[PDB]
Structure 1
Amino acid sequence: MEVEYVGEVTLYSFEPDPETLFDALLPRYIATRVYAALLEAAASES
């Protein structure tokens, strides 16, 4: 996933570490995208 950057838009307080949450969430995001693709494929097939 290439990173898309913008300039700007209370900072968030992550626990235990932002990097650990990022590593544990990226696969979850990939699974979410795959699920969305599957749902859209089912709708298109119908």
Structure 2
Amino acid sequence: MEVEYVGETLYSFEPDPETLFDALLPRYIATRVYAALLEAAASES
């Protein structure tokens, strides 16, 4: 994935931002694959 930057109480991250980012990116890709599959099913119908 690429990176896009936008100019514009800070959030609390547990345990730290890096671990959550690592554990969430694969989840994001799984979500995108699921959305692609749903769109494919609708288009097929």
Q: Same fold (TM over 0.5)?
A: yes
SS in 2 for 1:7: coil
Give the deviation of 1:25 after TM superposition: 0.2
Alpha-carbon deviations, 1:9-39, whole Å to 9, x = none? x110001010000000000000000000000
Mapped partners of 1:43, 1:11: distance in 2: 40
Superposition TM-score, scaled by structure 2 size: 0.97
Q: CA RMSD, aligned part only? A: 0.4
Kindly tell me the number of residue pairs found equivalent between the two proteins.
Answer: 45
Structure 2 gaps of 5+ residues are none
Which runs of at least 4 in structure 1 moved beyond 4 Å after TM superposition? Answer: none
